Amino acid sequence: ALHFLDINATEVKKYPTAIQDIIINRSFDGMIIRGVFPRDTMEQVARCLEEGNDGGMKSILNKNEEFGTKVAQIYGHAIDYFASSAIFRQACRTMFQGSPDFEEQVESIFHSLSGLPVEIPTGPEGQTYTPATIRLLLEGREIAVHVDNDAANHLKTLLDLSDQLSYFIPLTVPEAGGELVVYSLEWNPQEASKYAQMQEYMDDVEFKIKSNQSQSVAYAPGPGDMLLFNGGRYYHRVSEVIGNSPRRTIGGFLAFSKQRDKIYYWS
Ligand SMILES: [C-]#[N+][C@@H]1[C@@H]2c3c([nH]c4ccccc34)C(C)(C)[C@H]2CC[C@@]1(C)CC
Ligand SMILES: O=C(O)CCC(=O)C(=O)O
Numbered sequence: 001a002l003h004f005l006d007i008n009a010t011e012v013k014k015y016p017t018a019i020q021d022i023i024i025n026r027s028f029d030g031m032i033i034r035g036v037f038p039r040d041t042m043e044q045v046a047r048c049l050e051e052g053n054d055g056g057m058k059s060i061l062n063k064n065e066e067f068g069t070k071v072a073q074i075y076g077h078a079i080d081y082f083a084s085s086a087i088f089r090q091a092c093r094t095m096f097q098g099s100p101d102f103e104e105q106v107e108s109i110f111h112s113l114s115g116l117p118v119e120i121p122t123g124p125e126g127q128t129y130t131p132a133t134i135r136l137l138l139e140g141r142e143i144a145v146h147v148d149n150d151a152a153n154h155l156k157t158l159l160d161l162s163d164q165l166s167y168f169i170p171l172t173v174p175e176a177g178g179e180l181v182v183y184s185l186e187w188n189p190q191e192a193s194k195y196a197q198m199q200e201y202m203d204d205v206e207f208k209i210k211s212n213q214s215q216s217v218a219y220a221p222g223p224g225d226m227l228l229f230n231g232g233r234y235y236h237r238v239s240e241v242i243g244n245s246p247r248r249t250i251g252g253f254l255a256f257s258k259q260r261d262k263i264y265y266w267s
């Protein structure tokens with residue numbers, strides 16, 4: 001049983017315990033927030049990436065050449081890391097041009113849905129984590145089915161009570177495909193231990209998926225819509241992009257602090 005909400009960005013203050021409801025109470029599993037950013041800004045940022053005037057973001061683009069087809073090209077280092085984080089935050093700041101700003105708008109959303117302070121995690125001696133990364137899926141590319149379970153790690157000491165949500169906003173969407181499919185099949189450490197390697201386990205997960213033994217919801221958010229769901233708990237994939245226009249998303253993760261007195265968001 002998978003249950004999602006679908007609200008407008010203006011409605012977020014009708015749901016001040018949504019992040020609690022998903023993570024702690026587990027009363028529902030995700031939501032779509034329509035028009036978090038404007039179409040103007042999303043297209044503006046996409047142009048900056050396409051044209052090359054991207055505040056030095058191309059410098060931190062990982063093409064992931066040797067893991068072909070079922071992975072994405074990614075701007076920034078996903079969890080040297082601390083360097084790219086600084087370049088990203090600066091670059092991202094440049095393109096959005098505070099109209100509105102990425103970090104300020106996003107933190108406003110997570111705050112409206114929790115009533116808790118929202119901060120980007122910090123390193124041992126003050127190094128910022130990257131709040132997000134930009135994922136680039138070209139024609140013919142997808143993201144293979146996976147779960148976002150648990151540096152290893154400074155973060156752990158700030159967090160962990162005890163599910164992590166995933167979030168993202170499309171900058172650009174493809175013609176067809178590029179759909180988030182979320183399955184009811186969950187991460188289970190007891191199921192995984194049954195196999196000698198993760199290769200064998202993921203083959204059975206794939207089997208269980210293709211045998212249609214699980215429920216699956218599919219979402220294709222439009223530019224500026226945020227998808228916020230329980231990626232650490234449920235297996236999910238982004239379907240194969242169709243047509244020339246790439247899928248570009250800017251996304252990350254979030255979780256409650258150790259004391260549940262904060263919300264941290266990063267990528
Ligand atoms: C795409 N992508 C990221 C993850 C990723 C995977 N495999 C990789 C190999 C080399 C570099 C990154 C990945 C998986 C399939 C776990 C991808 C999940 C989604 C990611 C954006 C997570 C940071
Ligand atoms: O499409 C994206 O940006 C990432 C999708 C995903 O797997 C996630 O948000 O956890």
Ligand SMILES: [Fe+2]
Pocket residue numbers: 146147148166231236
């Ligand atoms: Fe994911």
